[PDB]
Design an enzyme around this catalytic site. Structure first.
Site, PDB file in Angstrom:
ATOM      1  N   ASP A 143       2.003  -4.420  -2.389  1.00  0.00           N
ATOM      2  CA  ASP A 143       0.833  -3.889  -3.111  1.00  0.00           C
ATOM      3  C   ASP A 143      -0.420  -4.768  -3.016  1.00  0.00           C
ATOM      4  OD1 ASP A 143       1.789  -1.383  -3.939  1.00  0.00           O
ATOM      5  OD2 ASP A 143       2.872  -2.296  -5.636  1.00  0.00           O
ATOM      6  N   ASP A 182       4.061   5.085  -0.877  1.00  0.00           N
ATOM      7  CA  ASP A 182       2.820   4.437  -1.332  1.00  0.00           C
ATOM      8  C   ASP A 182       2.409   3.288  -0.389  1.00  0.00           C
ATOM      9  OD1 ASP A 182       4.919   5.170  -3.330  1.00  0.00           O
ATOM     10  OD2 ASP A 182       3.455   4.725  -4.894  1.00  0.00           O
TER      11      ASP A 182
END
Length: 371
Positions: free
Chosen positions: A89, A147
């Site tokens: 992330d 993602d």
């Protein structure tokens, strides 16, 4: 007319102005709890980069120098993220914050943290699997989530900026591997693919934040669409734009796509009339479709669909009134419904992708939104 866009931008600028006056750098606003209080995102939180990114976008839309000053303050408080090694992330966290900062200002203060972050992101790519490992916790040998496509943007940029072709190539390889394994025959996506770290073989195909292993989690479908639109933009590999168009058709023509174009939180729920909507998925889809519209042969259907989403997101139903909603811009996102987490709340990334979409839309239409 364009009045909806102008008033929505004015409102967004007010919200961001108040948010930056109220919250403290390094403890970014994330969502609103059931009791009305604000959930905050410290530097370890995967969403922590979105608020400073949204400030950069607010500055770009409006020219408001105060928003640029606030964006700097909220960005630089995230310096420690350049040392984080345990997550894919880093794109959402550093590239949305520092990445936007460096693009907008060219100021070298932003550059070294970006370089350090990119090396840490690339370190997570496994050559045998052909993908970045999304996370290190839990039972999976090597979990990769849909993602993770979004986090590739950081590496495409960094590979070029720092003359690190293996970084760029790793991102492209991740997109190719994901294109094969994360997608069902109908172009819906799984949430998680688990791989064998040595052989690279697929071991499991399963959900994490959707309804079932077989389902089409809406924000996941959006990350896929965006991931391939952006991978096309950054690599020019036609396989990615073709894949983006297939995904776009699956989404746009879906029987469960509501009339107002704000997706149900998962496309496969049985209760279409009453299922919670997910504004964050809508915003990601709108932003992606606007870029897709400029890349393809005949993009009008994509532009029109994005425009319709933006008109809904900008209506009273979705757009907070000035001073309300704990200074978040949009309402009605869903974080993780099956976890009873962040159901029907503003979310910082909904606001980020919404302003990104407004900026893309205004650029296409050549609309001046400066204060």
């Amino acid at each position: 007319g364009d009045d909806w866009l102008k008033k929505s931008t004015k409102t967004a600028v007010i919200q961001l102005t108040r948010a930056a006056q109220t919250y403290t750098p390094g403890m970014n606003p994330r969502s609103v709890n059931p009791d009305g209080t604000v959930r905050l995102a410290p530097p370890r939180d995967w969403t922590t980069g979105f608020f400073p990114g949204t400030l950069w976008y607010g500055y770009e839309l409006s020219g408001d120098k105060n928003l640029a000053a606030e964006a700097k303050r909220f960005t630089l408080a995230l310096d420690t993220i350049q040392y984080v090694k345990d997550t894919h992330d880093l794109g959402f966290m550093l590239y949305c914050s520092y990445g936007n900062a460096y693009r907008v200002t060219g100021d070298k203060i932003y550059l070294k943290p970006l370089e350090n972050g990119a090396a840490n992101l690339y370190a997570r790519f496994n050559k045998k699997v052909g993908a970045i490992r999304s996370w290190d916790f839990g039972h999976w040998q090597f979990p990769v989530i849909i993602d993770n496509l979004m986090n590739l943007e950081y590496l495409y940029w960094a590979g070029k900026e720092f003359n690190k072709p293996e970084w760029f190539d790793a991102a492209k390889t991740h997109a190719v591997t994901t294109m094969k394994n994360h997608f069902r025959k109908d172009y819906s996506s799984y949430h998680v693919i688990s791989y064998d770290t040595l052989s690279g073989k697929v071991l499991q195909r399963e959900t994490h934040q959707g309804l079932t292993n077989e389902s089409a989690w809406a924000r996941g479908q959006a990350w896929g669409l965006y991931g391939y639109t952006m991978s096309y933009k950054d690599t020019k590999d036609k396989k990615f734009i073709e894949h983006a168009e297939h995904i776009a058709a699956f989404i746009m023509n879906h029987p469960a796509m509501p009339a107002d174009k704000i997706p149900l939180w998962d496309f496969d729920v049985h209760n279409r009339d009453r299922s919670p909507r997910d504004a964050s998925a809508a915003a990601v889809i709108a932003s992606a479709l606007l870029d897709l519209s400029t890349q393809v042969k005949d993009g009008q259907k994509y532009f029109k669909f994005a425009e319709d989403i933006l008109k809904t997101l900008s209506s009273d139903e979705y757009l907070a009134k000035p001073g309300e909603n704990q200074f978040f811009i949009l309402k009605h996102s869903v974080g993780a419904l099956l976890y009873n987490s962040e159901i029907d709340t503003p979310l910082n990334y909904a606001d980020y992708y919404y302003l990104e979409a407004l900026k893309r839309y205004a650029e296409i239409k050549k609309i001046d939104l400066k204060t």
